[model samples]
Target: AITMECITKKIKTIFQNSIQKCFPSISEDAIVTYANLKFGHYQCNNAINIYKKYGKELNYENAQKISEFIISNINETIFEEIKSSPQGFITVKLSKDYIETSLKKLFNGEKIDISININDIKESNENYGNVLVDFSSPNIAKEMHVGHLRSTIIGDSICRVFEFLKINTHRVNHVGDWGTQFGMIINYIKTHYPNFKEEMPDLSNLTSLYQESKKMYKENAIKLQNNDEDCKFVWNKLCESSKKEFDKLYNILDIKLEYVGESFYVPMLSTVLDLLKESKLLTNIGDAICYQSENFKVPLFLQKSNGGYGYDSTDVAALYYRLTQLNCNCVIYVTDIGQLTHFETIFDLIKKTNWGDKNAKLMHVGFGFVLVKLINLIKEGTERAKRDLLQRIETYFENVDIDQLSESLCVSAIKYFDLKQHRNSDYKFSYDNMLNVKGNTGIYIIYGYSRICSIFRKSTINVEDISKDELSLTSIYEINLGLHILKFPDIFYYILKNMLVHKLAEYMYDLTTTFTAFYENCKVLNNENEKSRLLLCSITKSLLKLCMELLGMKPIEKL
Candidate 1:
């Protein structure tokens, strides 16, 4: 099997080799891109640039002449036709045999085999170092609202992409388990529940207690910082309770993250302040210590006016720990777009510290807000989606794994709804729209995968045996599906380069449509060309499942 991780790269290499042979003096890389389907499969439009640069010296009259010479010097087995346009555009069409061979090699085994080199596709062309993704942070005693949902959804998708690439990825849940908010909750819990040590208050009471304690938080914060036994015990109880609630939802959503909270960096805050002081980036603005730089208009507060460490200091300490202690080469912070400026300030401050690795890559992956119902919680959306899917599926089928399929569909609906939207722009959440099986919803993709499975379910022929047979791409529909399936690795490269999950979503949706076109146009069961069509369906299903897994949605085998 060939390693067709990037078809565009391979085509570009072929054109570069042809260019080098024809115009030996030309030394730049070729620009090859997917052509308009009307013209050809792939187009190389570098002839004009080459002619402009080297035509006079290479004794070429015009761009068209250069293109003809380049094509003449090439002897490629992958392309059946290579034609030059009047505008010096060189377009190539893949041979049917070549497409069939490529698709055969892709799914000859029991599964889709794709091995990609991370370094080759990266812009830096260097292997990635340890990667850390910081996301899904929720405050103790606070409910996970729409913001945490977006962060969790987007962060997990990003982590999955890295994981698929076999990179060293660390999913960090930077929980807000520290600060004055916790002090308020602790004070209220200790006063309201006297027997809290034996039996803790419920989540609703803890939440209500937080609202009550906010008016009298200053004193409690001091006592908590001073190590009061009552406040400490209350704090631990609240954190433990909140974590259980968080983990329950995370389990339902299938999210895995390492718990690292602000409390974890409390011990390093003073040391980080000392390091910042020694680095001379700190300035006393009023009573607060701030890091002022020309890059930002406002100074970032490191220590508050009351000489107490704030969230800003905790962030600085956490970043310093990541760079120096964890040895992370790339660190990404996922949150709302409103925090863009805040992270920029933090990254700038960390860059000035001697404790940080200057070569470490730091980025803030920000997304727009989710506008939804007043009670807009992920748990609520999930439950509603499950009910809606259950209602729909029960009408058509019965006695299936109702719970598992419904939950899987619910997760798919919500995750795909969020991931399909452009992350930088806001999207309105709707269970009706996301759960609909007709359009570009997650249920549609799930149903698409399920239908493909149903094809094999109705057939007695072994998929493994058919997968081993040579797949033929004769009809236009089969060729289109084959080409789209081959573009799988390129989509991953696109996501890696642009840091956009929507690209994957868009590709996944298109893949389903492409399979539908082929499925409708060609017959699979008990037909003369059943083997080729079944192999096509098999590969399409695998790729769709892979995309589902990448978007952090569970694939359902039925419904």
Candidate 2:
């Protein structure tokens, strides 16, 4: 009873504070009732943040001040609603009675009309011009593993986001077609495996061969320490063999990159080195050449003492070319957070160079690792996990037809799970969580979308025939869903400004959950008011498809 009272009080306090802030002179009860109807339920922290940021900027701090005052004045009655069970997170128990009364008073004389249209919403600058996104980078001859999966999906989503905002987007693969790895691979094949070039290598099959070759290289390196002639011969052969293997994988991946790699800058390296030496940034530590920048605690290694140019030199050259020759306004490096320091050093070096100026933006779009273990569970858990977890997940999906398991579903599960978590934080790859067809998983969202699509297929009514003003918002669920749908453009703008893709994924999941509730409670196909119902379904389907597409999930109309 105390918990219930606390929940009610908190809701009232939140509502009262929000309304009074939006409209000064309103009584606490009146403000609470008004906000309860407006938002259905009080989003405490969300409302507070919004009020603080926008209200203060617009010289309307009264709303925020009122909210702050109300929060401070609230008694312990509001504290009971926060439960510390079920993993110890706070849980607010919403009171239906209070909610109904508040909602009734709030909407008693209100008009149910949309004051704005989608076209009236502000446009984004992210898509104002030509945006070239270089991602999905997989080195030649290496099997496309989980790392490549993360890059490709994330890159695709970014491209989709840009394209959706009416921006011209170029999706570049930036294949690792050239590198020293190839030298070793190709060398090995020529000496040991004659006619290896004639036999086309499949990437999946070649992965093991590459691993074996790498192991052999390590063993040979031990012998090289003793200046063994046989080790040198073996190492040379391995380099040649690796290159041949890499070429096959590139072809199979169907990637058409700009063919940029470490070797591409070989000719330009000498010039760049001369410039670095002149700039007094070059530091020779032992046999290796490096650049010491004050921005980082550690120095940036450019080339090994063995005279082989590293990724640092290639990246610097790439940045120089992109900024000067390509005339790019921004150069984004998409990689995992493990290389954060390395990229930071590169950016710092670029800043010291004359080319780094206000005209261009050089940024590293770093991300955390793909929870490989979690993904494995989602994709193939039941077969692997001896526990009951896999059995439970399998049972859940069993109800859905196996034919419905589309690539979109698989990709959606992978991409959404990856992007849903904060980019910098590490995530536990839980197959059970990711593959679950219910709750916040990608499969659930996909299922929700497919359910909507299924309804559209059965209906003969055209959605465009109905008027927007005529679309009913009588149900609490409908109004709530509509409000969220209207905020999609705003969410996109926020993500672009912050470069936080996870926010968008969270919004998608919320939208789907709302739609699911609406589907269960509100009738569409068999309703007497078929026109409005059909219109609602149509608009929602459009929005869902748009959101999924933005997250790099292709829509299956039939699924």
Candidate 3:
């Protein structure tokens, strides 16, 4: 149903036609995937898989015969070329003439993207209804730092993808705004400012209150125990200040999320414990409680010996409330990789409680921590520019503000530096390496988008007016770039379904490389192929801008 060239319905028709000839009474999903151009752009590797299961009944001597059967029976109208390799592998090639004409007609006519759905592409997520994204959940008493950069940026990108697809996605900020931390924020406030009664209205002197509150909380937990009942007013005020601080960064980053403080789950701990008792799974360690799951070696401690709600229990309540009360069909938590076992414990409880079934969709999008060290090792290959990065860019492009340009460099560098790697793979961080505007870093991509923008500034052409007849791909670079552009939506959709934003980072980098080659080898402004090439530039820039925005980046046209 996805209209994308890579996931088009046409491929499915040919796939079904070819597959039916081998097994008449059979039913199967045709696995057609977008591939590297050298592997024939689109690949159908399911032939051998199908033959392996049904070869004896289908009268095929070997998997190669099934591969040949599929190739021979494949409809040539859609595929300009099809080649069969060993082990029932069939590489599909799209007609270049067809690609050029379709690119023009598809983009210019209605201009949404294409779509491709596999057995699990859409249902791989397989949610019941609403999507809940719990990200950028900085603790209530903390300031936004380099540590928060990954959560804020990655969360926004994921939300943007859901928004792009028009799914009802809820952005929830799961902050640590409850527990003994309240005692610290509370005692620190009234203790310092005696007249905080009147000073509490505008919520002044809060950041310092929160900064010291955590230390006070630790002491309170150790010394006075839970004797902080009088800490409510300042605690609420401190929580409010933390939200405002979080909003400031979100505002700058253009991200939005609903506040869901742990206070909501704090009071529900007793109820969650009651359910554990009813299920006969709760083991009492005198005053505290624990849940020893079937497969886990460690028992999930639900409460402390003081009978206060533990961190594990708090999350269990949060997830249950979100799924049953917030109306979320699929629940996702984006956090660092260290919490992998911690969440797995909670998820195991979700199954034991019958809150979610075995197939109930959920995810823990874990990412590696960003380090402060610079990537000083020489990584050559990217075309190095021979001038001051910001200054050189400003000279060619007019009216560039230095501060926003700095933001451009930092955002691109910071985001791509983290995003380009596998979420599970760790890497050192750097500003010089990512912002150099010469390497395979964010500055390169920002400049790539800006260079494409300058082309439109000089050329005058309405892309809407340019029909399929005006479209042409005369060069190798143009054809390759077109194919890269075609993979845009499919790439994001694929990532959205599987939580592989790093591949998306690689996609953007690959795209810029392709466009750079096309720019150097071909001409767009004031040339015979101006309109057609302009169309390419227009779509490329739009796709880049779309992806950058999704990745929580500002794609500045000037630099």
Candidate 4:
């Protein structure tokens, strides 16, 4: 909806036009950012900077002159209150009458008060191109460990946000179902005492199988180079088995991911090498072929001396195909920060090879480590996190029927915890903290939403029939809640630009806090201000649902 853009544009121009009246030469670089909410809704801090930019006499002049000129000329219709400080600070509070009116009109109409009609501004505001999000990539023939949780949920959250904005998204699961890891798995299973090669082990047993595989690799010097038919059959078995196992977890998580295994790129490795050779970006480093970067010291290794393709080589092939063949406009990989340099080199190669279309965005959306403390007060740390699916489910539910809310609560806790902190920074994980039903948790948001649903269930209020009447903001709590509710769209668009999950989480937490305070302070249903407060409740509930959905959590109504 141009609702947000229209207002922002209208107010921004007043200052720009006002600045032009006095200082005509300095037009650009007038920074308009969201001001301290404590002060005003938005602030334009550039009066001094603009005067300083002219480089003539004005560049040396004090910003106070320009500040005064701006205050003198700013259009009052767009702003309920606009003021300027000595150091070129122009603070603009949008007309609350306009916002409250606009908000009311939006709610009363077919809009449902979720977001300004995004479709209206989508032509200009939309992120152009088909974005590819590669995430939740767990290796085959191994357990889908808790650590990969971040990539799975973070990737889903991102894809959901893009989809919500009507941007085309490709949810890719870059499964690690290739490389020597397969041979390692098969080799370990084959040589083990069980000798029971007919049936594959359970998903939970893959960890033990992986341990055995690694042990054999170290002791027996296990190699799959030119292996016999039986060994190759075992390799195929392990790969197939793991893929099926992974499907089990994906089904439980209720997430859909398009799988592209390392095996998929095997055939194209030689062709990619040829393409790299054509581009002259490939190099013959010691033991492996590399992409030599002038700036970064570490080169991306492509092929080992034994003619074995490296993991990085597979990444190159996949990325090359996605950019050059898959009709992808942009490719975003959501992995842990540990893979920072690996994908940095991968991205650097994307640029070096000129594989992708010009101006296509290639980003490695990195996340922090998943450090677990406990499942709860009594449980162990990482082991509890790494427990079997059945055991984990038992712990999560304890025989409670696993509905979406119940099922999601377990996964959403980790997902929110991973997101609640800034992606680049590490957070010591605690199920207790994340699973807490009271405060600053996904459960809290869910519970808050549930409360709204309960109110609607009992009342005869038809949410659709609520008319465009100006909402009353008599109490401080009411005003605060309404103001905070207005910030949802701003935060949503900000995440689209920055691709940070925690920023949205912070907003959601603050929203829950404010709504809770409003709940306690503002009377609802059976009170003097019942109908008016119900309107607030409706908007709050709608926004809360939208926010949680964006975070990849379908808020359980009965939670």
Candidate 5:
């Protein structure tokens, strides 16, 4: 399989062998990575670190000197050039034959070859196995706004990446279906709609109802906690109404999440507290039962003065459930950056008590919000983008499904725009920028993908029927495109290690531009290297589509 580690591992192994041969005293793993196009296809920058650590003992005056010794010791035929830079960067350019062989291997291999294992993620020997992603958790009775949208899209993309890697990933939408707010909403529904039990009244204006019910909040919360059957019935009705609305949005966005809300952990809370009590980690700080850790001065409240569990209590129980019951080795929480400290406290407590595995990773992937504090925007954007698509394609084709295409474009634009930004940085929304045809937008990339499809449609050569031996790289443009196409796995590995969805988004844009350069210069139809060029196009389209799919966007065949 052509995992991110496959080719990169080979290069590292070669370099490691060279280092061992050159300096038997030194022990260091090779740090090989894709280099700048102008310099080489790949480079080893570990020479600087190696030289800095053992320069005196190794008798090397400079990093460049050590780099030269290592390159000289390498006896590889796969590389055409292995040159050391003044900065100790060992640049490597693969031979033409090697490039062709690698590309052919990818072309002939299954799409599943692009996958990576969980163990390969951290480069750790510890196999912290299955993954659980906690994200898109909208509170019950509250409208799903832009904040939830950001979390939903970003979290979806992250899960897709994991799924693409063939990892056993669990997507959880920890909805706030339980809490004081629920009591308030239930009270309002009971008072306002006396016939709610006979026939549930419209919870369509749930936010307004919630606002109007604020006065009865604390009392009803206490009542609900005391097992008030009336409150409980209304709560269930409210949850059901909210769920339908949530599912509608999720359906459109193509998101899949298990609705394991706060209410799900209600029974688990007492058990969690007992476990913590057994370990003597729980302390009574004033009226609140809290978990105090050395990392922070403030303690996490497990139970409030009213003897009811809060966020801290439920979250701890959720983490425990995920680790012990679900048998997950990694539990990732995706929320806004505001929740960073809260999750940090939860993780600290989990670390204090020995969980399922001491090495289990608890990560908080916090993201910032877009300026469009809101779904009316998503609806409007989709409508406009759909209209634009219809107008542009009216002359070429008349039988296209306007509804489905617009929805895809709208989702792609929104998802890509949000993903392209650094997760921690807040950004303003812009319809004009997202819908632009020439710039680095999602539509541009989609258009680029469709352009490749157009090429295949025009060509007489069938991609699958083409001979592997005929696929050869000659021109600079062709070589560049082929090299970039092959580097997808490496880029994926980088994204895995870094956990930056934006990097993958940026990679998709870069790929389209690379294809553009190749398309402009090279001839793909009725040319001497047409078949080879078409092969490159074929690989490019597949890889591009793979990236798009990973980002939770559908690839359009034509634009």
Candidate 6:
């Protein structure tokens, strides 16, 4: 019935028609087909590359062939379009009617129903195998401030992501246990509070002690400069006493840092300084030892005028030690974006020293600042308002009778908020925006997860009671939800490759919205289609739990 021109037209029509059916309402003006094909090719290529590198029998030639076939024939257009926009914004035209009719016919006569399973397809299993994440690092003897909260939450979430994919992840806190802060604190304690050693210093009390010691040290330093001999002795003594106090706080935080401070590399400083000098990279300006690089206008100050080693020296030693001694494949520094220049100089120095291609990667995972100005502003507004806000936020946690709320709502809220924003862009900090239970907040996602849990508890039937093929997806809501749920593994690949946490957050929000729609419209336990409904509910519950764990949130049975 179809001629060659008709077949050619039909083939072009087949591709266009298939795209329209898969992704409904695609505009004629939009570059939909090319965009879809581009994304499809990217995903296909990534999968093929991984298979070629790691699969037992799969080589590049076979992988390329498979990738080409997938991009051309399969639901390649949909996935390709999805891949084109890292934001996951593209809409495929496949409707429920098209999928059921076309997909069924396409596979019915095939030998093994060679349809792609997005759920089963994995991109790279070898990549995340031995990920050592250095994060949540709080300075010893200092208050665990809002800034430290971001690092802890982000690092924890990264670990959770890697762990979910069966990766061996080492959470290195890299705590600031040893530093010059201790020298001042110890000196202050020895001079003013001789009896400070009588009582064991708790971190709660130590932070206050540190503040008082610092204040006194500044006062004494000013007096000493004015030729006060007595104050000078007191300042010196306080520095010694503070070191003891700092050690006590380290115990309270319960993290091991391996004690690689600036002082630890004191012996190697001169050697490194000499190397910098020989390499013609050292810049001596205004009594500061620095290294100037072509990468940036600013120079890296190695030591202060007083010959005290700054953070730069510490980082240089750390990088060298990691590459040579620790034999690390990579050294990742997790810090605020403010320190970008400092690390840039360190990285430059390493490269200039011909340490670029020794199988070591030095990465600076910089994060935006967490502004607590709003919390401070709320406290400043009214006498009781600040107290009430703190109490309310604290009360929310107290009400949740769970032991691991730290891993659940408290940390998850901060991580989700930070991740939901574009990583490079600065995000406005708002407590109300982050804690909202109705909208796109982490709490809302948690509540959705808990709702599914409640459904499972209410259903007396076991999840395994339903057969695999018996789980027929019929309704628009069910089909859409299933499609979204099946894309979880693919989404994981996207996150792992891109390091964009917001994509995962966006996926969770979309999945939750689809689940909510299905919950409202479709019945599960008491419906005429009870078997299929129960199977859908079971799968949904499992997927929701998996997602919650990946986001580093605790699974709650009740909201």
Worst 10 residues of 3 by lDDT: 373-382
Show pairs that collide, candidate 3: 2-115, 3-114, 3-115, 4-114, 4-115, 7-116
lDDT of 6 at 277: 67
**CA lDDT of 542 in candidate 4?**
79
What would the per-residue lDDT of candidate 5 be over residues 1-559, giving only the tens digit for each residue? 6444456767888999988887787668788888888879889998899888888886888999989988888888888888999999899987888778877776434231344555554466644468899999898878888889889988898888878767789999999998667766766676677887788887788777777777555577778766788877888878888898889889888998999988888877888988987998888888888998888877899888987675588889999999888888778888999988889988999988876877787888989867732456778888889878867767645588777788789899888888999999999889988888777788888888998999989877777777767788887777777777766666656666567889888888888888889888875445777877877888788888989988888999976
Q: Higher-TM-score candidate among 3 and 5?
A: 5
Lowest-lDDT window of 10 residues in candidate 4? 372-381
- Write the residue-wise lDDT of candidate 3 on 177-268 in tens digits: 76555556556656677677666634555556556656654453333333354445556666777777677667655678888877767667
Stretches of candidate 3 exceeding 4 Å from the true structure: 1-17, 24-36, 48-62, 108-121, 143-145, 188-192, 200-230, 285-287, 354-359, 372-390, 393-400, 460-464, 524-529
- Global lDDT for candidate 2? 0.56
Question: lDDT, candidate 1, residue 233?
Answer: 84
The TM-scores, one per candidate, come to: 0.89, 0.65, 0.83, 0.83, 0.93, 0.64
Tens-place lDDT per residue, model 6, 1-559, is: 1100111122233445443443355422112221242122122123333344443554434444433432344453223132212222232333444333322222222211212221233322323324566675656556555566566556566666766655555566555654445556656655656665554233336667777767776453444434455544543344334444433433332323333434356567767666666777687879988887877888777878997665577668666665555555545666777877878778878877754335445567778876522223323322232233355467434576343443345445555677777665677767577666666777677778778877767887775565544555677677777656545555655555456666777878888888888878885435567766766666666666666666665566665
Q: Rate the local accuracy (lDDT) of all candidates.
A: 0.81, 0.56, 0.69, 0.69, 0.81, 0.54
Clashes of each: 0, 29, 6, 2, 0, 26
Model 4: per-residue Cα lDDT at residue 267: 75
Q: How many steric overlaps does candidate 5 have?
A: 0
lDDT of each residue in 65-108, candidate 2, tens digit only: 54444444444432323222221112233343333332222121
lDDT winner between 4 and 6, please give it: 4
Candidate 4 overall lDDT versus native: 0.69
Off by over 4 Å in 6: 1-129, 193-204, 218-289, 303-310, 352-361, 372-415, 425-431, 524-529
What is the lDDT, from 0 to 100, of the residue 184 in candidate 2? 46
Q: How accurate is candidate 3 locally (lDDT)?
A: 0.69
Give the alpha carbon lDDT tens digit for every residue of 99-208 in model 1: 88777677525667755667656667333678899999988877788779889999999999899888999999999887558766665666777788888777655566
Pairs that collide in candidate 4 are 1-117, 1-118
